[PDB]
């Protein structure tokens, strides 16, 4: 444990739309509306030690690597940025959408890919070394959410067509479609085994798809309710605990929402937010949480 | 008797074929001026100063960008002289800020809560046919 | 003393039928129409064809007497204040002469800001006990005819040269020869002889 | 010492009321429930 | 005069002070963003009429 | 549902997502300049007040003397700007 | 100038209409002081010309 | 019960409770000027009761113009009032 619990952390300007915490666990990003990337320390006092510039639009999505060295940020003037976990550099600067930059996701333990989706109607790859796009997907819609499998073999995406789309990368062609959501998709997130993949949507009904080989056919696994869509219509994320074993959800009602994965019943219900939530985010060693929210502020519970 | 003018260089080559007009909106002008408010309200007797200054400056406006009447050396002597002005003119080449009256319509520390007037939104989406005249012109929807 | 506390209280009928309002807050804008001190001024549009409302008590004489700050009507139920004290009893005894007015202001506002500041300081214990013949004439949907334009005086003088413009209403304005007419601010704030109660 | 700096500047802002001269907009939000509720009253809502 | 102008050029130079560095006011800045303040431009002879009404 | 409505749907996002996200609301965006006003505006404002006997006026009456704290500053730097025997 | 009891002129008509009246201006040598006279008598003499001085 | 409405609700200031919100400006508008156009905007109470998506005002002309903001392209067009025009700015004493 570190310090005492809550450690409220506060520094930004505007809504906070994303958080994700280091591989090791020792430091913490920060992003949002405030065109600005903030990295600041989990233990000792928490401080600021790095800013870093290099947007001209709200930071949508942030992710990491595996190993804590490349920092991936999703911004909404149609870039993406690449840059180093230390010494603050842009490294790699990537531009392909015609429209704004929903989210992006890294796949994991392959080569050095990217996945985006934007309000263009498009689902792009990309390759870090080579300047361009790799392979690209014309939906028909608006695409709000996109993450890999651990295999680097499928891009799971989800839009504002109610449907969950998962495409083969050999054969560049719509290999699942899944449907159970009955209003936008917000919010992705794959599992750390691969196994399972988490969803947000905007029918206020949080769901588990388990993305398999062997298939039962009609992957509606786990249904969570309690968590509120309402008229800001914010791209709501959602995370996954290390061991899988607790599952947290951003909500428009400013109740941190984290269920057990197991016996879907509410674990915490968390308060302290003025404004509603963006991103919940678990600690990768220990049950630490990142809480991010539109009320500028970031929260650090200790379980 | 002129405008007296503050160059006292000859004014350019197109000069005396727009200058009936010119004088003719500066008279109008002249008579604005000196209009006694009686039944005009307080707001509503600074009215017609920014409607002929609107009327002035979409008069070399439309000589110079559509009928392409005027050379640069007239044109940016009657933007020196007084006769258009240069950041009403610089708005109607934006996009959708093409029948602007005023530079008090558009700026946003003018009002209460930080936006244009009611005059800047589009008579569509007021829906219902109200009648309108923004306080600080006297304008019935630009956009 | 100033008063300066945030966020008004009002009903729901001067409120405003929207649920989104756009208030605008001046520090000590105007002086109270009872208390004579200047309070914090709030101004907000309720609807569409409506009439600008603003607060036109302090905080401090809506909590000693448990009103609305421009209706001048009981939070609860939303009816005059002598009608309220006809079915309950009559203890506050406000001074209206001037010196003992300033001095029991004083007081009170010492013993408002001596206290929590959530209740209506005399009137709890009292409020209590409820449930007279005021309830079964309680309003029980808004009266939005209040938040309404005043009528045009140049249109009573048949000369309204803006026409179809004016935001005043064009219609009849009440006979004076009625009791329902005179209705001052102070004799509907303490409860004395308000027709309408 | 927090406590009373606050109140210090409240004084000591009578001395130089004009200087260069204040700006006020940070335009806020607030959450309001009616505690009313019966509803006629927001148009049919909880909160506004 | 000349004996008195040295005088004044000599107690100007002995009494300065250093600039001391201050936040900087801009006063006029803060009267034009306000809703009460507009610009113009006008002949001088015109605004000194006008603050001479102004003052009476 | 219906293609009519996922498109309608589509629409109404990509209206929103634009107007939501466009260059003049982002966060340091400072907002347009005050500009020049016609030089008749004062002018008549000036005129219209004569020495404020009317009654029309009298809600301002209140804010002259308030402008009276300012009018040496005015003064300077009305008489710092005088116009130099070589200018008309 | 003007007298106690005589109220000050309106500058509308008064001054918008008359001319005003040649000032000082000593007649420059159009040869021995050429690289002076087409600017020296003006208000802000090289202000629009990026070459002698920046901006406005 | 030795209580009423307003001293059983959860009140922070003799008439309800007020707690600073921090909605995005742009949707606040958005629904403000959707109910002042046309009478209907969506829910800003955060429990009310814990289900999805219910719509605040009058109800039956929202599903009939399917729910739109003032900020999108409307569905009726018609019935447009017809007024002068002189954009020409150069006949004198007829220009508006
Ligand atoms: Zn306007
Ligand atoms: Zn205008
Ligand atoms: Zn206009
Ligand atoms: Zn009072
Ligand atoms: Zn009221
Ligand atoms: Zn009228």
Redesign the interface.
Known sequence: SLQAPIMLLSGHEGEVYCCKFHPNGSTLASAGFDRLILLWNVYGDCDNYATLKGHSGAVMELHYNTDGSMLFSASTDKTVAVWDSETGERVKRLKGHTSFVNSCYPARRGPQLVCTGSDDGTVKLWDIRKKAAIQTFQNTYQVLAVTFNDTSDQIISGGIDNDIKVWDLRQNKLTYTMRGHADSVTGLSLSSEGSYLLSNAMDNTVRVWDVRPFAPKERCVKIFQGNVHNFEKNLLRCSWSPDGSKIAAGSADRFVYVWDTTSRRILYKLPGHAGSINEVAFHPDEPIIISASSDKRLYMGEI | ?PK?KRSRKAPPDGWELIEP?LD??DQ???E??TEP?E?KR?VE??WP??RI????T??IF?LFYKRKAISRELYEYCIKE?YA?K?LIAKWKKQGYE?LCC??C?????????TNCICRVPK????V?R???CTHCGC?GCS | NWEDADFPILCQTCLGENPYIRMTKEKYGKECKICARPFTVFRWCPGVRMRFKKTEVCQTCSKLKNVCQTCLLDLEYGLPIQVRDAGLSFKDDMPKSDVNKEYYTQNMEREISNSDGTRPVGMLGKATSTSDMLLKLARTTPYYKRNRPHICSFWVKGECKRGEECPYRHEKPTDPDDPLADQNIKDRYYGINDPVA | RVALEKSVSQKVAAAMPVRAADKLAPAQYIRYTPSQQGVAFNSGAKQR | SYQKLLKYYVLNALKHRPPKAQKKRYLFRSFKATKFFQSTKLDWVEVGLQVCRQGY | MSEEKLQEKARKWQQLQAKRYAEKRKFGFVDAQKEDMPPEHVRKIIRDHGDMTNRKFRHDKRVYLGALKYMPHAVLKLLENMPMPWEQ | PFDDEEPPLDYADNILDVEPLEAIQLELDPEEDAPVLDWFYDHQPLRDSRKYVNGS | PFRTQQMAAPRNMLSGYAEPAHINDFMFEQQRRTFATYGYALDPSLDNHQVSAKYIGSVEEAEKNQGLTVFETGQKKTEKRKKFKENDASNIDGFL
């Open positions: 008797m007296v007009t003719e909106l109008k002008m002249r604005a001026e408010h039944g307080k007797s600074l100063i920014f200054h609107h009327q002035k979409r008069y439309d007084g002005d950041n029948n530079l008090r558009i700026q946003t520390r003018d009002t209460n809560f930080g569509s989406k007021l829906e046919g009648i309108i005249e019935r």
